[PDB]
Amino acid sequence: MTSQSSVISNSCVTMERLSHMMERKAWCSQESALSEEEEDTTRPLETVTFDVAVDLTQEEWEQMKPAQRNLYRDVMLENYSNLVTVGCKPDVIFKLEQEEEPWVMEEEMFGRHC
Template structure:
């Protein structure tokens, strides 16, 4: 076992699941994801800010990421290093 990463604490949710959540459940999801990321940073993990956190900070839905090379919509929870 190595150190804890954001992938270890992320809660993946897909569009078809998101659509069934009410506004309080969506807020809870956002709060938990932001807290998970904040806790990792506070422990001294120097990680790039994951795309999902950027989206949530902007008030956007978590699956709205387009990869330039693929030009397709998909869930992209992790920002590639560099």
């Protein structure tokens, strides 16, 4: 009741995690562009594919704080509804939006009613 801080940071953090987030992925050798020249224009794109998301795991669900636990679902998941909302829904998902966790043990028989 004497340390009522001043609070300079609290609900405003990532705002200092961006600069430790968006530098990665542009890397190495851009030396002397030895493959210059050109020619023509014709061959189509090649729709990337959702090669965007990393399939899940059974075993590592204890090493995941509500940042790693929760979230996760959002970012991988930020790719999608922005191209499926301008340009160009896997059962792989279906477990993302409804609390719980991917495995419902329906295998075999008993667990009791009460």
